[PDB]
A paper describes a structure:
Recently, a shortened Dscam (sDscam) gene family with tandemly arrayed 5′ cassettes in Chelicerata species has been identified, which encodes ∼50–100 isoforms.
We evaluated the cis polymerization of sDscam FNIII domains on living cell surface and determined the crystal structure of sDscam homo cis-dimer. Thus, this kink conformation may reflect a physiological geometric assembly. The dimer interface buries 2109 Å2 of surface area, which is composed of one FNIII2-FNIII2 interface, two FNIII1-FNIII2 interfaces and two FNIII1-FNIII3 interfaces. Y420 appeared to be essential because it formed a hydrogen bond with P395 and π–π interactions with the symmetry-related Y420. The FNIII1-FNIII2 interface was dominated by hydrogen bond networks formed by the side-chain of N357 and Q485, and the main-chain of L358 and E486. In contrast, the FNIII1-FNIII3 interface was composed of both hydrophobic and hydrophilic interactions.
Author numbering:
A (entry chain B): 297 to 319, 322 to 519, 523 to 589
B (entry chain A): 297 to 317, 324 to 370, 380 to 519, 523 to 589
The structure:
């Protein structure tokens, strides 16, 4: 038919509109529609009598791009007017929370939150951003929320909470949102700010591994650091402790290890007031 | 701290237990996944021989240490999956059968290792409850499938799939409404991509019960109108489109026709030409 229009759109429905085409008279109207993404899709079809200039398509997925064609079939079945349109269905609120919530850095006044986006299939509409809420753990007050950009092209998302109190436990949640509304919140993350007295946790990273050895490095930490302690253990085994008197030290190579064995490794910094909070704990398998 | 014990486990909690022959007790715990994790810590009095850790993730494996030293491992209790299966795909393969396929929900939403899936189906046009069938989890595989059979012909069915684990059942996928074939008109060919070039696209489909009199190949640009290539030849089972534009996305699908008329279409392909 000529002048095919999507007259109105819902999140799961769309009303299609056209005008009577060139007439051999029209036997029926044939409506095809399918998802407009890459890869093979289902070709949905639906008939309408020649007396109708309209139809409502139902059971569509929200926030999804569709292509649709109306065909005016003929007696002759030849040269039958066709026209294809493209549209996107209305939005619905995200149905899944962000995942893999993660603390990256910490200070006495700041907390760096990171998270991965909920899977695209649960967006039901392109995300407009995220809400990061936080509160002190033992407080009746509600969460106070901060707005973050969606950055939908990035794998990782992050936000730095600041102007916090020292040595305080905060509860953190993240929600995604789009034009329709807000999705569910992630599970509570309970994070304690530093004290500003003990050393900050080092940033430990894997340097090298072999059949018998593992090497790791970390950045120097901020009252003068008097030393570091490296901790390690087999996945089935007790913790062992390598004391590093040297504060020039930012590297260490474990030796005499077992082949094809997973070791855990983390580092702590010490100053005159005692041992600071630990790094992330690494999982490294002995190899080449 | 001798003989550390996980005395009991919940889905987000765990009670830890020990004896010790001291300043304080120091309780470290972390997720037992690969890659760098967060080392969570809590302190407890010297007067306590036990502590309850809170706000753990369900269906998650943890390692734990108590220091006055000794490290144990456990897995938190299960919770029901919180997401439905994705990428639902059903084609009426016959007048009596429908083959359903789906991808698993993202593992972050399992909250416990999946035991399988439930495939529910019912006639659309009459008020009925869904009748559910059990399928194995096959968590190793990327794609999952179930062939619904013993159906009526030329009937519309409503299809849903759910994941489930030891805690219970996850939410269902949105309805897929699919109609079984009539057993008269040709069954929809199964068309797949062979090759693409800057100027061409080549596709294939399966060979043949009533003798097929011909095929029609339909194609169009992502922005454009449908074009129809009639193939009265029923022998070859392949075709190569020519004269296309470079770096352009084309839709393609194939219909078969016999004495009774034109059969239901293929799946619709989306193929982009090379540079
Ligand atoms: Na068209
Ligand atoms: Na501290
Ligand atoms: Na065109």
């Amino acid at each position: 038919p000529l002048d095919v229009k999507i007259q109105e759109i819902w999140s799961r429905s769309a009303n299609i509109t056209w005008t009577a085409p060139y007439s051999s008279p029209i036997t029926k109207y044939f409506v095809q529609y399918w998802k407009d993404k890459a890869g093979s899709q289902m070709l949905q079809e639906e008939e309408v009598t020649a007396a109708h200039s309209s139809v409502v398509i139902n059971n569509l997925h929200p926030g999804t791009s569709y292509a649709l064609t109306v065909i005016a079939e003929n007696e002759i079945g030849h040269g039958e007017p066709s026209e294809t349109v493209r549209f996107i269905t209305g939005e619905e609120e995200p149905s899944g929370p962000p995942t893999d919530l993660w603390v990256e850095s910490r200070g006495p006044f700041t907390i760096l939150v990171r998270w991965k986006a909920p899977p695209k299939e649960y967006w039901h509409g392109k995300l407009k951003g995220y809400y990061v809420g936080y509160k002190m753990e033992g407080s009746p007050q509600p969460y106070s929320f901060k707005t973050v950009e969606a950055m939908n092209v990035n794998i990782t998302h992050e936000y730095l909470l600041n102007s916090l109190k020292k040595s305080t436990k905060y509860s953190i949640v993240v929600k995604a949102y789009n034009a329709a509304g807000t999705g569910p919140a992630s599970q509570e993350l309970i994070v304690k700010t530093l004290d500003g007295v003990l050393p900050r946790p080092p940033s430990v990273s894997l340097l090298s591994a072999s059949d018998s050895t593992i090497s790791v490095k970390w950045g120097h930490t901020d009252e003068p650091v008097t030393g570091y302690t490296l901790h390690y253990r087999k996945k089935v085994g007790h913790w062992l402790h390598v004391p590093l008197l040297a504060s020039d030290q930012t590297r260490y190579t474990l030796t005499g290890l077992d082949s094809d064995t997973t070791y855990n490794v983390y580092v702590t910094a010490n100053n005159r007031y005692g041992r600071g909070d630990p790094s992330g704990i690494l999982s490294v398998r002995t190899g080449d």
